[PDB]
């Protein structure tokens, strides 16, 4: 009830990559029950970034993922509380990244609080290159455990050469309170930047979500 089919959301977050720090602030908006949304990103601190943007992206909203009838929403019924979630992502080359977020409601906006640390990029690979070109289409498998959902995706970064860049995302999702738990289902995403300004200091996002179920 307390998820409008129109919502907006605040965002920030502070991280590192290979030791550099930086913050981002931003804010977006979509339809939670149509699984879309938008973002405009800006740079606060340690700017311009020495890495790919990509990295940032999927970081910035799992309450607008398009649910079919019978598969029961779990971030949504979180709400007014919330949720969190915990995140590792994995690169073939060897880069990895934790996360940690906190998604909270004061007066009828999202609130979404994120923390980065990434390490051992390699600094000439394509991230600290800033060689990437965006994340393909990607499914995520989700299944439930004590009352809170584990993710995993096996996903690619596009390369500015032609190539493909390989990575792996585990996530634990959990709720602050209790809510009805779905089955194992599956999520297709697709997230596109869809501008930025000259050094990618000012960036806009759109991304569409949807749970189906799993054939096998």
Do not use: C
């Not at 311009?48 to 992206?57: G, Q, R, T």
């Not at 809170?148 to 390369?159: F, P, Q, T």
């Not at 493909?164 to 779905?182: E, I, N, S």
């Amino acid at each position: 009830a307390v998820i409008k089919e129109f919502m907006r959301f605040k965002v920030h977050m502070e991280g590192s990559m290979n030791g550099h720090e930086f913050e981002i602030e931003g804010e977006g908006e979509g339809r939670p029950y149509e699984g879309t949304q938008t973002a405009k990103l800006k740079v606060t601190k340690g700017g311009p970034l020495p890495f790919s943007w990509d990295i940032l992206s999927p970081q910035f909203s799992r309450a607008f993922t398009k649910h079919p009838a019978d598969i029961p929403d779990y971030y949504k019924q979180s709400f007014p509380e919330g949720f969190k979630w915990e995140r590792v992502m994995n690169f073939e080359d060897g880069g990895a990244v934790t996360v940690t977020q906190d998604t909270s409601l004061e007066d009828g906006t999202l609130i979404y609080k994120v923390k980065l640390r990434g390490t051992n990029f390699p600094p000439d690979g394509p991230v600290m290159q800033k060689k990437t070109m965006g994340w393909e289409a990607s499914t995520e498998r989700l299944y439930p455990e004590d009352g809170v959902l584990k993710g995993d995706i096996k996903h690619a970064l596009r390369l500015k050469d032609g190539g493909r860049y390989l990575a792996d995302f585990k996530t634990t999702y959990k709720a602050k309170k209790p809510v009805q738990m779905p089955g194992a289902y599956n999520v297709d995403r697709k997230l596109d930047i869809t501008s930025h300004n000259e050094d990618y200091t000012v960036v806009e996002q759109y991304e569409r979500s949807e749970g189906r179920h799993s054939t096998g």
